[PDB]
Design a protein around this ligand. Structure first.
Ligand SMILES: NCc1ccc(-c2cccs2)s1
Ligand SMILES: [Yb+3]
Ligand SMILES: [Zn+2]
Length: 606
């Protein structure tokens, strides 16, 4: 059962379909309309059901063309308010009914960010985007806000006519709005049953360019050309993901490039992946994020975590396929390079939280925990580490990829637990149960800290990062002269980034050393967001005051929480930048993403 949802569980009733008819009111910052839920009973004599809501205004509820009784319970913090509906007629098991809810969103909907024209690229039009994962769909429309339920959906969205609506669904036509000629209705169908966290919407001055046989890239006109180039490997990645996971079932694979305040690297919304513009490095070097979102079309979107306690299933498998696509594009040594990097990221997470912290568990218990608060690299990297370990245990990538294909096959269109996964692992590897019984299951799955066993990693690409980093850490003042631009001449951007990651793990370094890095390596000039992030962190942690404006600038000019949160934290911990950091947040707080705002607030203790 889903301790993050207040709705009737899948064993009571099931949403089969949503028809959403709504208007986007930019002047009031509200979404207004009707959510018509097709619900199938799972019980005999069913007379009421409960739905999640969060900051919604319910006008009325209609069943069989008549209003029915409903009530909203007390707010339970981040979980929202439960809405109990009284059914006009007892249902028997498997009976279906349509329930039509008239509702309106609040401007503070934790699902939405409303952008004024000045917050956009074009400076002429406002912009709306949604982010439902994990439990924010309830802040757009009443629903069983649990990934244990999969529904199809259709939608009609009315918007000022000069703007474009897109959703996680096949685009199904536009027409002027018969109730308002200043408006267009855009229509959408999603024929593949999805968890409701995969529902997404964007409204803005959007344009598109085709980059492959089944891919259009979407953004404001100012980002289109750059985006078309950054993501040109997309078709290639799909073909590799199709080869590894099986047929791509979703029709198209489009990309939406969001304004800079999108809180994540990516969101695997079906048909329309959302990405940060912080990927636009100009050389495709951050394309692993595309590989990841593509991979989700199997791991996460076909096979879905039953509850957020099993989030690792979504993330760990997706990181595993991601790394396989990049290994195919750039070679097995590179797969190992990124795998070993990921391990480093896991050391960081475990060290940040504390080696005994509950959030360092692979399977977590989210009872009274806000999933946004619990979110970290753990399910990603501990998840991946288990799978890489098992890969090496059970006889290599080729063998384990067979299990991955069979696993997707076996659980398509379903929602599963860690036990469902493990049961199927044992079934599939029935001739290797003696080997699988060597795995410390309780530790891997249920204990905090780093995993009991570290996988084996090829070192070829990593060595030169470690060596350079060791030169800087162990350098004294009379060694600083020996450093030079030519040190970097054989390192790709991935290696520079790993070099900085290596060095960041022993930060602070002496201030003199950092100043010298700037002198010889001119890291200030790199706009690769991953490199710049780690470099600015190293500067602030080593107490370089020159870096304070640069860090404040990055933290606020984009809002990818991966970058913004640790930047603000670093600035707060540094005494010279503390007050400015707090001030800056307080100034930007109202125009930030509502989730980013909330979490940065918690990080800063404000
Ligand atoms: N898949 C990209 C994501 C965006 C937000 C996510 C969360 C998962 C659990 C709590 S927040 S996962
Ligand atoms: Yb010396
Ligand atoms: Zn993911």
């Amino acid at each position: 059962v889903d301790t993050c949802s207040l709705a009737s569980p899948a064993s009571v009733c099931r949403t089969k379909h949503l028809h959403l008819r709504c208007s986007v009111d930019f002047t009031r910052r509200t979404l207004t309309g009707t959510a018509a839920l097709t619900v199938q009973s799972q019980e005999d004599n069913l007379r009421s059901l409960v739905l999640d809501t969060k900051d919604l205004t319910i006008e009325k509820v209609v069943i069989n063309g008549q209003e029915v009784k409903y009530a909203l319970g007390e707010r339970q913090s981040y979980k929202g308010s439960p809405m109990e509906i009284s059914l006009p007629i007892a249902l028997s098991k498997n009976q279906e009914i349509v329930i039509e809810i008239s509702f309106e969103t609040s401007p503070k909907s934790s699902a939405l960010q409303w952008l004024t024209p000045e917050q956009t690229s074009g400076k002429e039009h406002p912009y709306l985007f949604s982010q439902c994962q994990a439990i924010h769909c309830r802040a757009i429309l009443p629903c069983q806000d649990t990934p244990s339920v999969k529904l199809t959906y259709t939608a009609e969205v009315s918007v000022p006519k000069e703007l474009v609506a897109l959703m996680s669904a096949i685009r199904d036509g536009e027409t002027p709005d018969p109730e308002d000629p200043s408006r267009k209705i855009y229509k959408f169908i999603q024929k593949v049953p999805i968890p409701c966290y995969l529902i997404a919407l964007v409204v803005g001055a959007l344009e598109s360019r085709q980059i492959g046989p089944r891919t259009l890239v979407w953004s404001e006109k100012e980002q289109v050309e750059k985006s078309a180039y950054e993501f040109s490997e997309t078709e290639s990645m799909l073909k590799i993901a199709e080869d590894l996971g099986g047929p791509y079932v979703w029709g198209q694979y489009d990309l939406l490039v969001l304004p800079p305040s999108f809180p994540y690297g990516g969101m695997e919304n079906p048909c329309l992946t959302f990405v940060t513009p912080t990927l636009l490095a100009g050389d495709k070097s951050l394309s692993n994020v595309i590989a990841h979102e593509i991979s989700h079309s199997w791991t996460g979107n076909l096979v879905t975590n039953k509850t957020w306690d099993h989030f690792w299933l979504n993330e760990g498998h997706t990181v595993y396929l991601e790394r396989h696509i990049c290994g195919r594009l750039f070679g097995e040594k590179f797969r190992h390079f990124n795998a070993l990097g990921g391990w480093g990221e896991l050391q960081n997470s475990v060290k940040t939280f504390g080696e005994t912290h509950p959030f360092t568990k692979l399977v977590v218990d989210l009872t009274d925990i806000d999933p946004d608060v619990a979110y970290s690299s753990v399910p990603y990297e501990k998840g991946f580490a288990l799978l890489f370990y098992l890969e090496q245990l059970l006889g290599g990538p080729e063998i384990f990829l067979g299990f991955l294909k069979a696993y997707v096959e076996k659980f398509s269109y379903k929602s599963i637990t860690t036990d469902d996964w493990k049961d199927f692992l044992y079934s599939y590897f029935k001739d290797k149960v003696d080997v699988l019984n060597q795995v410390d299951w309780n530790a891997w799955l249920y204990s905090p800290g780093l995993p009991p066993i570290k996988p084996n990693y090829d070192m070829t690409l990593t060595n030169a990062c470690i060596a350079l980093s060791q030169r800087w850490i162990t350098a004294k003042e009379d060694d600083l002269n020996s450093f030079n631009a030519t040190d970097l001449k054989d390192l790709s951007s991935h290696q520079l980034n790993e070099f900085l990651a290596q060095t960041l793990q022993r930060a602070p370094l002496p201030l003199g050393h950092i100043k010298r890095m700037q002198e010889v390596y001119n890291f200030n000039a790199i706009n690769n967001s991953e490199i710049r992030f780690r470099w600015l962190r190293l500067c602030i942690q080593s107490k370089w005051e020159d870096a304070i404006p640069l860090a404040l600038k990055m933290a606020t000019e984009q809002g990818r929480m991966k970058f913004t949160r640790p930047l603000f934290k670093d600035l707060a911990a540094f005494d010279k930048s503390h007050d400015q950091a707090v001030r800056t947040y307080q100034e930007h707080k109202a125009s930030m993403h509502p989730v980013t705002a909330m979490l940065v607030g918690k990080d800063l203790k404000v």
